[PDB]
């Protein structure tokens, strides 16, 4: 019927990077022609027939566009297949990166929603949110102009592991959505739960994070704190798994919470422990 | 004074297929001092629009450069790279062998 067109490794590719278009038609990566939405009936490069793949590299802004392929069907009335699914190659690095912020924060409870706000002092007409490693098209929103900044609120949820990971956002201006700015700094979205919360308690202060669930790792975080501490979980003879975080004599105190995590699961944590008050 | 004669390799960017546009490479390395003269030849004659990488060197301080130009290999035409250096009395010519 129709081929499957795909970009590898990613259809969102920086200028100067590399992306390969393949046209899987009829049980093989076939001979194919390529069409861009600008000229739906004219094959590109004067009807060039590509063998196996089309490696665009180094990627230029001219590579950006909305592609379809037609696979070679030698014993066909037209000799070629129906148009494929469309693949939109978006080339990035053409403006300076927007900013990406999570509201209320990057830790999202399982089953709840989070807002990913992309914004910039640059008057971007549209913004694009892209999860790293994902093949679907980036989500598009209009840049709402307000107080000299352009910005847009992406709603993500209900939070599951499939929605956690590294996000970047992009700006565009009069680009037909094919020319993108440089990517914002990466933001990691982490889902918490439904794994049971650890226990956090004081054990010259040392905080013990504990559970019988076989977490491989414990993460200690202070409310309003800069960086977390992480530590391997130690198995105890009473079937508990525990790590002891020495805070030292510097003190200053605050409110602490701890999370469990597992190996090979970077973007999910347990439910946070109850907050623990540490005295000065 | 330390003098190291260049190693020379002549090869194509992609596997050679007659009639297909490609890039002919001349990679000179391991040489010292840095003054070197590199030409890509077609039937013994210098090719004009050749480009080259910025001068750099390896951990042992020996220099390396890549010279390259766009070309279309044939069964008929014979490509080569010609290198001269203070270590060489006359230019050294290395023929392109699509098999290395």
């Amino acid at each position: 019927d129709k081929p499957f067109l795909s970009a590898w490794p990613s259809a969102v590719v920086p200028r100067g990077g590399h992306v390969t278009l393949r046209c899987h038609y009829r049980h093989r990566f076939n001979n194919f022609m390529l069409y861009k939405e600008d000229r739906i009936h004219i094959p590109i490069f004067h009807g060039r027939i590509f063998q196996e793949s089309f490696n665009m590299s180094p990627v230029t802004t001219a590579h950006a566009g909305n592609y379809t392929c037609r696979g070679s069907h030698p014993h066909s009335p037209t000799g070629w297949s129906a148009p494929s699914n469309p693949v939109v190659i978006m080339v990035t690095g053409n403006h300076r990166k927007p900013s990406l912020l999570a509201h209320p924060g990057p830790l999202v409870k399982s089953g709840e929603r989070v807002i990913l706000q992309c914004w910039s002092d640059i008057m971007f007409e549209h913004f694009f949110l892209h999860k790293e490693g994902i093949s679907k098209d980036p989500s598009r929103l209009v840049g709402q102009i307000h107080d000299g900044v352009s910005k847009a609120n992406f709603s993500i949820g209900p939070m599951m592991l499939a929605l956690a990971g590294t996000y970047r956002c992009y700006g565009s201006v009069t680009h037909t959505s094919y020319q993108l700015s440089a990517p914002s700094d990466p933001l990691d979205i982490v889902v918490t739960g439904p794994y049971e919360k650890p226990s956090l308690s004081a054990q010259s202060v040392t905080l013990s994070c504990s559970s019988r669930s076989s977490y491989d790792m414990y993460h200690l975080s202070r409310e309003g704190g800069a960086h977390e501490r992480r530590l391997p979980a130690v198995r105890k003879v009473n079937r508990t798994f525990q790590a002891d975080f020495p805070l030292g004599p510097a003190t200053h105190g605050g409110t602490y919470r701890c999370f469990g995590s597992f190996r090979h699961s970077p973007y999910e944590l347990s439910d946070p422990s109850d907050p623990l008050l540490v005295s000065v | 004074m330390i003098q190291r004669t260049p190693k020379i390799q002549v090869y194509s960017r992609h596997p050679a297929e007659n009639g297909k546009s490609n890039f002919l490479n001349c990679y000179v390395s391991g040489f010292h001092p840095s003054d070197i003269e590199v030409d890509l030849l077609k039937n013994g004659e210098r090719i004009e629009k050749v480009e080259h990488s910025d001068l750099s060197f390896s951990k042992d301080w020996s220099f390396y450069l890549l010279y390259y130009t766009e070309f279309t290999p044939t069964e008929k035409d014979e490509y080569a790279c010609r290198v001269n250096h203070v270590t060489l009395s006359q230019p050294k010519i290395v023929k392109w062998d699509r098999d290395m």
């Binding site: 490794p9 100067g16 440089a182 | 004074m1 330390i2 890039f23 001092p33 840095s34 750099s56």
Partner: protein
């Protein structure tokens, strides 16, 4: 995983053939990203990879300032070396510098470098602890005594542990799709008869990044280094690299030999074996 940033600079004198020339290049792993050439009309530090072009003008001003300063310093250093070695005004001489840092998978500092050479031979080098200098000869002992008096090692240690590491981490995120990619080697073999009783098996690795690769030949097991020809890894010119390994085998014994390819882009080592 592991990553490196490197700056390589070359200053040459050529009396009667031109003014002294300074060329500096910057690398992240095997990818060059900046250059400066005292001969070019730019007089700027120039981008050489698309992902560094995102950096703002404050970056290029600062980098240009530091590299023009080095350009002037190392051209004067050629004149200083002439006195240290009591050499003629008429000779041509080379002065090279290498600088940079390594970081592990975590992004933390692993090891830094700052080394010089004069006319192809080691001149002075910052030791591993980034606290003392290795002077190769008698001239370099003077530079060592000078740099101890100026506390150069202390400044370079702080630079190698701070800005170098922080800059590398920043470069790796800005050029992520390029610098943190692994292109595995595309492999194949060729069979070329030498005589009727002997032939060459050549094992090919093409289009891989980064450049680090291992090509080994074995028959029925154990290294077959006996007449294992191995060309130096070479750039294809498009950002990827090439290498091949060849062994001469008795005619009819090709099935005994296997080529093994190890590369960061291959999850499991390849074993290749030729077949008619």
């Amino acid at each position: 995983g592991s990553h490196s940033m490197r700056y390589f600079s070359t200053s040459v004198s050529r009396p009667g053939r031109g003014e002294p020339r300074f060329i500096a290049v910057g690398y992240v792993d095997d990818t060059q990203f900046v250059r400066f050439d005292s001969d070019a009309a730019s007089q700027r530090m120039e981008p050489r990879a698309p992902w560094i072009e995102q950096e703002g003008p404050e970056y290029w001003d600062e980098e240009t300032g530091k590299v023009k300063a080095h350009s002037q310093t190392d051209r004067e250093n050629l004149r200083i070396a002439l006195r240290y070695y009591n050499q003629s005004e008429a000779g041509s001489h080379t002065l090279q510098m290498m600088f940079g840092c390594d970081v592990g998978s975590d992004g933390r500092f692993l090891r830094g470098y700052h080394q010089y050479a004069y006319d192809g031979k080691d001149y002075i080098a910052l030791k591993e602890d980034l606290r003392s200098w290795t002077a190769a000869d008698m001239a370099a002992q003077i530079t060592k005594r000078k740099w101890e008096a100026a506390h150069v090692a202390e400044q370079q240690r702080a630079y190698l542990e701070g800005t170098c590491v922080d800059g590398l981490r920043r470069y790796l995120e800005n050029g992520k799709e390029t610098l943190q990619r692994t292109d595995p080697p595309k492999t194949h073999m060729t069979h070329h008869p030498i005589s009727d009783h002997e032939a060459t098996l050549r094992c090919w690795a093409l289009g891989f990044y980064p450049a680090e690769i291992t090509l080994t030949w074995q028959r029925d097991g154990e290294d077959q280094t006996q007449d294992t020809e191995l060309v130096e890894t070479r750039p294809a010119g498009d950002g990827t690299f090439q290498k091949w390994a060849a062994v001469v085998v008795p005619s009819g014994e090709e099935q005994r030999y296997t080529c093994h390819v190890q590369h960061e882009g291959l999850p499991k080592p390849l074993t290749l074996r030729w077949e008619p």
